[PDB]
Write an enzyme that holds these catalytic residues in place. Structure first.
Site, PDB file in Angstrom:
ATOM      1  N   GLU A 156      46.038  46.040  52.717  1.00  0.00           N
ATOM      2  CA  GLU A 156      46.307  44.639  52.995  1.00  0.00           C
ATOM      3  C   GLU A 156      47.788  44.480  53.261  1.00  0.00           C
ATOM      4  OE1 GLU A 156      44.637  41.946  50.264  1.00  0.00           O
ATOM      5  OE2 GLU A 156      45.824  40.232  50.963  1.00  0.00           O
ATOM      6  N   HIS A 209      40.817  42.043  40.885  1.00  0.00           N
ATOM      7  CA  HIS A 209      41.736  43.062  40.409  1.00  0.00           C
ATOM      8  C   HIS A 209      41.261  43.555  39.055  1.00  0.00           C
ATOM      9  CE1 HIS A 209      44.150  40.376  42.976  1.00  0.00           C
ATOM     10  NE2 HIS A 209      44.818  41.463  43.313  1.00  0.00           N
ATOM     11  N   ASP A 261      48.608  30.390  50.694  1.00  0.00           N
ATOM     12  CA  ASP A 261      47.224  30.629  50.282  1.00  0.00           C
ATOM     13  C   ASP A 261      46.429  29.329  50.231  1.00  0.00           C
ATOM     14  OD1 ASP A 261      47.596  33.329  50.133  1.00  0.00           O
ATOM     15  OD2 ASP A 261      47.965  33.328  47.964  1.00  0.00           O
ATOM     16  N   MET A 279      34.010  44.066  46.865  1.00  0.00           N
ATOM     17  CA  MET A 279      35.356  44.570  47.016  1.00  0.00           C
ATOM     18  C   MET A 279      36.030  44.485  45.667  1.00  0.00           C
ATOM     19  SD  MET A 279      38.732  43.512  47.118  1.00  0.00           S
ATOM     20  CE  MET A 279      39.097  41.956  47.934  1.00  0.00           C
TER      21      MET A 279
HETATM   22 MG   LIG Z   1      45.052  38.791  50.124  1.00  0.00          MG
HETATM   23 MG   LIG Z   2      48.544  35.366  50.572  1.00  0.00          MG
END
Ligand SMILES: [Mg+2]
Ligand SMILES: [Mg+2]
Ligand SMILES: [Mg+2]
Ligand SMILES: [Mg+2]
Ligand SMILES: [Mg+2]
Ligand SMILES: [Mg+2]
Ligand SMILES: [Mg+2]
Ligand SMILES: [Mg+2]
Lengths: 384, 384, 384, 384
Positions: free
Chosen positions: D179, D52, D255, D86
């Protein structure tokens, strides 16, 4: 629908005080002084506030600083008439608790967790709290090998037994309430539901000192029926406290204001609490969404109480409605409350009408009339 | 990975016998004669079979027909060496049970439910069953007013207490296992999780006669950690029986073959069962998908046992691996098993190293090393 | 809250006609003659009925029997004024469809599925249906290797393209609506959500012929926000039809009567449908619970319509309330409807107030006032 | 199972850099300098990193500070050979985005969001990124009235259309990947699944510039089959990027490292990606659990790659196994790949073997042999 202190609505300092930090965002609101929250909540008609130790006394505070924070708080309570019916320990925020408090793998952390808890039990009793809540938010695991759950339950029992020994040794008139949650912030949390907590309590040395503090949203994070779980807690005599909020199904713990989320479940909860004569605090463990400024915070807190009071009115109207009372008989709720076999086992075994001569097809054809009953409930909920 | 009767793998008649009728489709397979299932399961290496009364004796059968069905079954057991370690009652298929058996609102249905159960307890004992499972699949509700849960729990307790009185009065050496399920076919089922069932058992008159029969897929329908729930059942001394299958998360009860669904949960389950020395039957409550013909049925049943045996090997290799044993110490699983305060409450309170002199930052900085441990577990699971 | 044919309430024959067979229980209700359901639904104020081919014409019927079943049905429609706005194909009940219709691995089954569909399209058009729904309930898999999803989507596209070619070749004024469902009866169903179906439609040869028929409960089985999904379908211009019912979160497909389940979601759905001027049928795909006798069936069907009408009143009152209109402005719903950059990309890039001179802290401090707005919505829903 | 840069494994700076702050706890790890993460990831065998804007350049940085942060980063890339395939924008952390970026109700915020995005697109292109990911984590709502979703989709389309105009106007060879995520941190997030995102893309002015960046855990938060969703994305030609991690069912976004969570889904994902020849980065969007110290961070990151490589080996062995190839034919996967009616609509309509003379019972009796196939898949996964 104006709340009064009579309604026993309570709020955690951490609720209206939530600064709005979530896993993906910084705080959107400045910190609230607990004194201001007490004042504002009293103005809204709250009965009292609750606190984690670290909400009231910043972690790492000196004894003189602790002194000052408590005195300021006590003055706000005296100024407002607000009570503190419940207190709890923060065993989840500080990094030291990253693997739990009472069931941390590290023994020294578990000992620290108990000492931190005991210090706040003393403060809770000083402030008049009747219930001491334990939410083991860090007790659990993300992976299977990290936590032998039998050992962890041994450690959890040991911790609660020592706390019970402590309050007994001190002569404190305080009871413990275990607050289950299925997950978050751990991948799985130990004692994940009301049922698991109730079962665990029965293995403690002094079970009478321990009950549950179920939270609406937490049981709904497991897709469970919260009124059903509360009914089982009541049936066990273990509903010591309750956390009211809203949750939209199985996802992260939303802590929406009460009445948000599953509204019909909120209706049936209020119906049950009021019908059963639950006399404890109606405690809101909610978070004003971080979209809100402070006016939105107090609006959300007011809505917690407003929605309880509306549902209370609607549930009372439902139960008082003679057409509903007839529908309940039509659905045989009266028969549900009658013993199956007060005549006893032998009479049952000898009763040919219970088996040999039982007309299963005639019984099977009897409609339960549940849908008419539920639509009367809907009509009452909606004021229709 | 060849199963032997030593491995105590058992199957319900209704599992390989499932004709494939689901809520949206007709049967895809012809009915199996129980005698053929016993024979086929024995050939696959099963240890035994289990049955609902209505699996073995068609509902409405005469006493002479019942006689004949049992004798044929007993001959198949004698012919194969297969045992019947567990039996249960069908209190869910017949329309008479549409609102429950033990907690049906209609009193006469509840009495019938008990009489139907008692008759099968006698048969279960005759056939050598050690465990009698109760799955109250119809005990619950779709709507809030249909079922006063406190009354229903009263009725559920009454039913189980009468069954316990019955087996005691008869001198039967059989114990009861309550099988929880959160929902389906009722919108919510009473005693929805292992925890709720464990808690309920503690309120029965003779709790020692009752344990749980948890099912992999059922706890996972509430998004719960099945090994965690089993650990709590073991900790309580209440794991009397277990139902093994697979489930892909929170949805309808899939009853996939064991090892399907959540494979890592299956690994951790097998690890726990074997580590704890669970000695009961490894029972598969699964449904061969209705896509399958009879060859697929036996393939699916064989895979149940095969996957258990593979996971057993991998879990044993995991625990026996000295690098894992070191990793467990690195993650302080050894410290988790040590008492927090065997020195007692006063010593804890006087221990300055537990609070005043506790270095919270040094403790907080200690990594738990759980991810290395979990990757060793993964490597072992995958044979890598 | 009396429905009229003006309200366009429609019911599937299979809804009030559901005999109550579920995965664990036999039928509790006798079969309904479609003629009787048409009559009874007309008496309740329904506008029309819908049907699967196999609801109306028993599978395997001769052409003369088919003739007779249709003529009897048509007479009931003529007698009552009931319309048939939608029809669909049963490609899920018969064992031949156990691996799907359009995406069955067996090519001959896929061809049969298309021929069965085409025959019912002709009948649908004859009866005046404007929408032909496709619910591929068997299109999917329980295991990963059973279904190459890219190939299956090829087959699904091929089937829908051929159906579109068929209706075009015949000059039929009928459009197709794909009904998504995430799972049940397959472990995972292809095109599991409104979004997947919308995306799939864009790859069809004649996308204009295809829209979605979302079902309340189906999107909620994935924990999704049904009004949000409907809004996206409306935004795409693809809301051709809608199935209304109730669902209590992520579990088996409950098909509760509309208004049951997530009541606030039902409120926001009705608000959206009415605000957007959705002009299609308000179709109930629900199942009267199998606890009910036939009086309960019609009570449940009546409640579907009643709850829609109550929510419609409450949503209209909400939107018409000047205090709500002010709250919507306070929350900047008006600004949401304004273009972000109608001045265009270059003007945006040159606009220093959009970045260099943007006061991010003053913007961040603005409360959204969503909680006050949502409590007004709650008050309106509850008639408070 | 040693990764090489050939394997195209990439990691977000924010992944190994996650300090462990969750909704209930403070950071357990110090901040990582991006330069150190690049170095450490290169040592582990990663191919590249992603970022980011706010990961790389602290929010509020001056242009000279921005200059310095980029130059240091570029030097680390040059020193290691690491690529940046990316990049993405943080439109979720700062309080200004509390109601969204592109679909914030406040117009000035939406304009700021676009300007912040555009500035990072320039940086992304400078650093060689081929894909620009958009995760609208704040686009959504907690309450129904806060967000008119049709207006919000208008605003979302407007934003993406302007970004597409921007990259076209600049001649940038970069594509966008949306996403999806169903919820968290908003109660519901717009475009909640791969399907919704795919459908949305088709309404953009230049759809060819936009694809999806699905995340394992995100689709599983809706209980969806991630390989199925990826197959649909591939079928649409829209799998521009993929986020790999682990998730244990429907709960908060865990995650976990890839391979954790649903292991069989990971197997089928790898099988699909490798079979379809997906050539994009294998990107891990994961969080080393906050229990871990920095050694655990790198262990968890290494395990991401290790598990991919193990599953790749097992999936390849599965597909290469002649017994599996025979099983696939036995289950008619070959027939699934054949057109249903390449002979065309008229030939189908005239084909009596497709309907009039189709033996539905013989077709229905054919077992699909899916369970044998799935057990071969299991055996291959487990190395058995
Ligand atoms: Mg993601
Ligand atoms: Mg996630
Ligand atoms: Mg909560
Ligand atoms: Mg709470
Ligand atoms: Mg099951
Ligand atoms: Mg079972
Ligand atoms: Mg449905
Ligand atoms: Mg439907």
């Amino acid at each position: 629908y104006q709340p009064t202190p009579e309604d026993r609505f309570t709020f955690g300092l951490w609720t209206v005080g939530w600064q709005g930090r979530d896993p993906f965002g910084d705080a959107t609101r400045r910190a609230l002084d607990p004194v201001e929250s007490v004042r504002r909540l009293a103005e809204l008609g709250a009965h009292g506030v609750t606190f984690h130790d670290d909400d009231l006394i910043p972690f790492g505070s000196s004894d003189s600083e602790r002194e000052e924070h408590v005195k300021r708080f006590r003055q706000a309570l005296d100024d407002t008439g607000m009570k503190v019916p419940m207190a709890t320990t923060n065993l989840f925020t500080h990094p030291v608790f990253k693997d739990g408090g009472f069931t941390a793998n590290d023994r020294d952390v578990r000992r620290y967790a108990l000492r931190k808890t005991i210090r706040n039990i003393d403060l809770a009793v000083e402030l008049g709290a009747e219930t001491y809540v334990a939410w083991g938010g860090r007790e659990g695991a993300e992976s299977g090998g990290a936590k032998d759950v039998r050992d962890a339950l041994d450690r959890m029992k040991e911790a609660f037994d020592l706390l019970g020994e402590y309050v007994t040794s001190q002569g404190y008139d305080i009871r413990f309430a275990i607050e289950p949650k299925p997950n978050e912030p751990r991948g799985d949390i130990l004692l994940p539901t009301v049922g698991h907590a109730l079962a665990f309590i029965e293995r403690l040395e002094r079970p009478e000192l321990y009950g549950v503090n179920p939270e609406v949203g937490h049981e709904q994070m497991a897709g469970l029926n919260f009124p059903h779980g509360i009914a089982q807690a009541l049936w066990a005599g273990k509903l010591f406290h309750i956390d009211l909020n809203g949750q939209n199904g199985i996802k992260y713990d939303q802590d929406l204001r009460f009445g948000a989320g599953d509204l019909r479940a909120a209706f049936w909860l209020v119906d049950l609490l009021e019908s059963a004569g639950y006399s404890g605090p109606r405690h809101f463990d909610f978070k004003p969404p971080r979209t809100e400024d402070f006016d939105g915070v107090w609006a959300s807190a007011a809505g917690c109480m407003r929605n309880y009071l509306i549902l209370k009115e609607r549930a009372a109207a439902f139960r008082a409605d003679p057409e509903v009372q007839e529908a309940l008989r039509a659905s045989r709720l009266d028969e549900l409350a009658r013993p199956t076999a007060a005549d006893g086992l032998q009479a049952l075994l000898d009763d040919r009408s219970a088996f040999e001569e039982f007309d299963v097809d005639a019984a099977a054809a009897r409609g339960m009339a549940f849908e008419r009953l539920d639509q009367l409930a809907m009509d009452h909920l909606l004021g229709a």
